[PDB]
Design a binder for this molecule. Structure first.
Ligand code: HEM
Length: 153
């Protein structure tokens, strides 16, 4: 878990994302999809968008990026008290979408990349530490539910 000073840093960095969640969201998905093409195949609506310029030209992708980051924002503001919010997500991603925990690792790394790409020199070493912890926590609680369900990979 995190200290309160650590949570205040992640909510301070999240205020930068909130200035434009769709712009941040589309960059995160693109990072993900271009870096790990196997992840795009899980998306029936977007698997035909194989290159960055195709991805960029779809408002449907940008809206999906908005759904993702708005969900995550909600969870971060719970400061770790997020069992009611994470359970549904865990369930759907394991039993419906069949998303291995490794893809959650990929998106967590994608977020960090995009914060440094969109705010160079503005994402401090301390901020990076706190954000990393918050994403690990998120991932580790989802891993716990995955084990319960025996979602093997
Ligand atoms: C920060 C991590 C993520 C969050 C907050 C998130 C959130 C969401 C939400 C809120 C939905 C809609 C409701 C649902 O079906 O639960 C959804 C759907 C979905 N997610 Fe995620 N997700 C995340 C990561 C991922 C990753 C890493 C993948 C795959 C590589 C993935 C694949 C999907 C798919 C395929 C759908 C259904 C798509 C559709 O409606 O067209 N998710 N996700």
């Amino acid at each position: 878990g995190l200290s309160d000073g650590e949570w205040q840093q992640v909510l301070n960095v999240w205020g930068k994302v909130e200035a434009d969640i769709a712009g941040h969201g589309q960059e995160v998905l693109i990072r993900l999809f271009t870096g790990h093409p196997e992840t795009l195949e899980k998306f029936d609506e977007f698997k035909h968008l194989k290159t960055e310029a195709e991805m960029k030209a779809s408002e449907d992708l940008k809206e999906h990026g908005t759904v993702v980051l708005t969900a995550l924002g909600g969870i971060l503001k719970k400061k770790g008290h997020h069992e009611a919010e994470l359970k549904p997500l865990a369930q759907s991603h394991a039993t419906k979408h069949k998303i291995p925990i490794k893809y959650l690792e990929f998106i967590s790394d994608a977020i960090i990349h995009v914060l440094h790409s969109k705010h160079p020199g503005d994402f401090g070493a301390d901020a990076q530490g706190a954000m990393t912890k918050a994403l690990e926590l998120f991932r580790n609680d989802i891993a716990a539910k995955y084990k319960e369900l025996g979602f093997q990979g």
